[PDB]
A paper describes a structure:
The [name] protein from MRCV (hereafter, [name]) localizes in viroplasms of plant and insect hosts and, when expressed alone, self-interacts giving rise to cytoplasmic viroplasm-like structures (VLS). In addition, [name] binds single-stranded nucleic acids in a sequence-independent manner and has [name] activity. Using an integrative structural approach, the C-arm was found to be dispensable for [name] dimer assembly but essential for the formation of pentamers and hexamers of dimers (decamers and dodecamers), which favored RNA binding. The multimeric structures of [name], resembling the ring-like shape of hexameric helicases, and its [name] and RNA binding activities suggest that this protein participates in the equimolar copackaging of the viral genome.
The careful analysis of the recorded data clearly exposed doughnut-shaped (torus topology) pentamers of homodimers (10-mer D5 symmetry) and hexamers of homodimers (12-mer D6 symmetry), representing 80 to 85% and 15 to 20% of the particle populations, respectively. The global resolutions for each species were 4.7 Å (decamer) and 6.8 Å (dodecamer) based on the “gold standard” criterion (Fourier shell correlation [FSC] = 0.143), with local resolutions ranging from 2.5 to 4.5 Å (decamer) and from 5.5 to 9.5 Å (dodecamer). The doughnut-shaped [name] structures reveal dimensions of 12.5 nm × 12.5 nm × 8.5 nm and 14.0 nm × 14.0 nm × 8.5 nm in the decameric and dodecameric assemblies, respectively. The full-length dimers are settled in a parallel mode related by the respective 5-fold and 6-fold rotational symmetry axes holding their C-arm protrusions as staplers, as previously reported for the octameric arrangement of the RBSDV [name] crystal structure. In this way, the C-arm of subunit A interacts with the neighboring (−1) dimer, while the C-arm of subunit B interacts with the other-side (+1) dimer. Interestingly, as a result of the loop orientations, the pore is more occluded in the decamer than in the dodecamer (middle and right). We found a marked ability of [name] to bind phosphate moieties in the three multimeric states, with a strong preference for the decamer. Remarkably, a significant binding probability was found on top and around the C-arm region, which was again enhanced in the decameric form. In this regard, the crowding effect within the pore that takes place in the decamer would promote the interaction between both sites, as additional and stronger phosphate binding sites were predicted by in silico simulations. This finding gives a potential functional advantage for the decamer over the dodecamer, which may be endorsed by the cryo-EM and SAXS experimental data, where the decameric assembly was the most represented species.
Author numbering:
A (entry chain E), B (entry chain D), C (entry chain C), D (entry chain B): 5 to 19, 44 to 70, 74 to 107, 111 to 130, 155 to 228, 238 to 264, 269 to 337
Write the structure that this text describes.
Amino acid sequence: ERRTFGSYKIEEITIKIPILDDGIFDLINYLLNGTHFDKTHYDYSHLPTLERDFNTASNYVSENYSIIVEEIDLNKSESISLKSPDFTVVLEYFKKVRELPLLPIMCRESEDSISEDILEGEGAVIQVLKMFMKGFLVHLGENPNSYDRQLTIEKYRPLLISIIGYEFTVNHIYYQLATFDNYPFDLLRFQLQSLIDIKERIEKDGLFKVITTTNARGQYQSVLLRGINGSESYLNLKRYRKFKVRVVGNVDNVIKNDFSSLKLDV
Amino acid sequence: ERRTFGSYKIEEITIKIPILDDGIFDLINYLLNGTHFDKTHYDYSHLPTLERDFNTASNYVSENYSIIVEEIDLNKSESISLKSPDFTVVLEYFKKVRELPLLPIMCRESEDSISEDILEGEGAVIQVLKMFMKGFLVHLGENPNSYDRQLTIEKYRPLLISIIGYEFTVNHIYYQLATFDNYPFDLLRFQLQSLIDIKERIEKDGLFKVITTTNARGQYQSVLLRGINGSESYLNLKRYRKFKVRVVGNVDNVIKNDFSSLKLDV
Amino acid sequence: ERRTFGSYKIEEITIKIPILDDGIFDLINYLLNGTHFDKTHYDYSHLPTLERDFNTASNYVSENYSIIVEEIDLNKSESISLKSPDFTVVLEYFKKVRELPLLPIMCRESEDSISEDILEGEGAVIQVLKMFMKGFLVHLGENPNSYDRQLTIEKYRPLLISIIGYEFTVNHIYYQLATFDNYPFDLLRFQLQSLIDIKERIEKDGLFKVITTTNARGQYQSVLLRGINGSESYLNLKRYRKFKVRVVGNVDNVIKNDFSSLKLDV
Amino acid sequence: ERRTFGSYKIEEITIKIPILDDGIFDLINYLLNGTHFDKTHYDYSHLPTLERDFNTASNYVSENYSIIVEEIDLNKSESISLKSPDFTVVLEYFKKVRELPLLPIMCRESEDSISEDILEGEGAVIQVLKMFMKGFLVHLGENPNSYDRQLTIEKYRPLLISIIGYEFTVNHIYYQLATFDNYPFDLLRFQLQSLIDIKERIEKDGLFKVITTTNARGQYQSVLLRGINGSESYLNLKRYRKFKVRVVGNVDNVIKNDFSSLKLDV
């Protein structure tokens, strides 16, 4: 049941709306367990250390997830969610509700205080997700679709955000890619090339803005990304699911048969 | 937009029930206009005179349909329907309701009184539909499906009925095929072979029974086919439709592009 | 209130749909108590040791059921259910929810470690159910019905599965019988004979497949039987009930009377 | 599709209420057409001239019905209804509403003015219906039912009324039978014998009463029968229908087969 890495899938519904399969839910869940690429749902020549870095990040995410797995009840669905710009995962577990900030880059006054092995773990993680996005876009170019003009990249925004955030906290392409989550596929397929210009000054002084609302019952902090267009965007949650693939097998071994052989009457 | 002759198609719906595309509605409609196989929605080596007999029958059905087309109003949907055993088509036309018995074989006391050219027209028609069913079943054998165990032949019953009716009014396979409209596909795919045994006596004395109910508002005649199992079946209407294929085109000319070529950052 | 062994019954409902009576719910319940054939709801000449093996299996199932009966509360309906391929029963009990795997054949690394008396108990059980199915099919042949073309064998699939599973873990007929749970009655009545052909190679390497879905809240294992058609099928639950027969007695002793005897006026 | 004369049938419905089939709707409809007993839905030794008188009455009713059939439109369901004590039938006919008093005995000041052939026609009719009721009751005695205690004779009241009306206008049994339309079947089956006593005086002075209500929009006449109990009853309409028997045939010719003959594995 393998599939190419960085993939997407397209599903039909009608009473003919299409929907996208992410390639995200599975990646997160695999990273939870430290599963290695060999025993994964996933021809990667131009992907150096794809399994190598992949498994390193799998391991790193595995212990990090275990860090909060310890407190979890045995008894206490799965609706994983992500938040920009520290790129935090969100989980729940019921009887029959926590988070973990995988890549906190908002504020880190421990540049040398944080050990270098941990730093390498994050660097592997970000490399994995970045070239993951690269594979996703090359896959986009590979096999187009009727519905290429029907949906947008909007899912993948925060990952690009984390990309450029690290880049500045160590580009134009990934930046402007993030700039328009509403941007459509076949568009990129046509004009991926010249998307280059703000030039220096709106990002020399912080890539993003932070504003907190004193809602008198809490302090709703919020991040406002800044785009090459010279604009801003609210960062927002996007809870995920994963479609429950049904249990159908395959015709694979069915014995096809001839009919002229049978003495059909005429 | 060609397709193989005698074809079927499989469509998914969910809130994953499959549905069948007949290869019947289109055939009837084509036969209405006398359209020739060249300009039809349809690799036919083992199908002798397929286009030849096909177009002969197209012509014959075209005039026959015109016989009642004349009375039709300009102004006065399409929900074509069929009745066994004289294999009659049923039409309607509204402002914004008739029939024609294509192959009346119940009673014909004009064996030589009916002209031989008309007889040849019907013989071409029945040959066309018979080898049509042959193509349908060979197509069944060709490409199986997950859903081969989910539906039955029930649509095609009356055609087989007409087949054997002509045969007797000039076999075991087509007969027993008709005998169980509820019969499933992949079943036939497995045990098409030995379906041979009633032996002579229930069909020497008429293949079918006729019973009329004096409903005091009419005389509902009805035909009761007799099957190799030694049983009977009510013959019933089955109104047809045809799914309205949407207007989507194709990725056909889309320019796929490379990505390692673009100076992606890493 | 006796009935023939391996029986079935047919019931009408309308606002004229028929329904089947299994001969399964009762068999299971009888086997629960170790009840002997004499004091059962059940002319068995061709059924050697029918009561003998029947009562042996009744005893074996009785202790096996008692094995989990012990934990049951006094206070804590009946909706018995079965699962292939280890052929497990499923029970519940409420105040006003367990199982037992009668014939676990999926994995048994105790071929000589399991005592021979237990093995004989299972062998008696499987013999009982197998010739039970034999009686069911001979009964099918005996008295046909209007509705023989209206339903399928689908209920009895897992039992046949267990049959062939034991056979391989010690045939074509019972195998192919299982292969199409959707297979219709009067069909079998006609073509029971030649249903023989995969030939060796798809079953030399395991009769079935096992696939588990890591649903992130559990590990849904599932079994995928392989059929002579060269295909697969999901194994599925089928919860049972039993119709509550009403309390009507009989005209049995009613005194029929003459009327010409009474001095009717004319 | 024959059945015994004067018959009844019992049908089940549940969400196990039984319903009765009359043997009345059919009799009326047959009498409408003058159909003869040979070509009717109907072992009559104790029924002298059953077909003879039956066909005489069939003829008489046929012309009488034709008397009003003449005015009927071609275009202008069937819900035949009956009224005591002149025992009048009630019909309707729509595009997609009359009556006829078969046996007017309320007032006839033409005792010799009415021709004797017409009189013989009515006498045949009344004999037919009377011994019809006789057959119905002997059939009741013949085959009892679980539901014999669930319904009453109420349908057949007016016919008995006409019987005794003629008798007086030329008994105890048929009289008292009519007296309690609510009377139950198996009751009669037990105590048919001694139902004999008003003695002369309430019927010497008219068997019935007539009362008309001047409803200021019409004159609703009504008849009030008098019973051996010394009581009265309103005479009332009872519109009829007839259940639409479905089109199912028969297993009649099905080939039952052996199973020990087939080389079943064990």
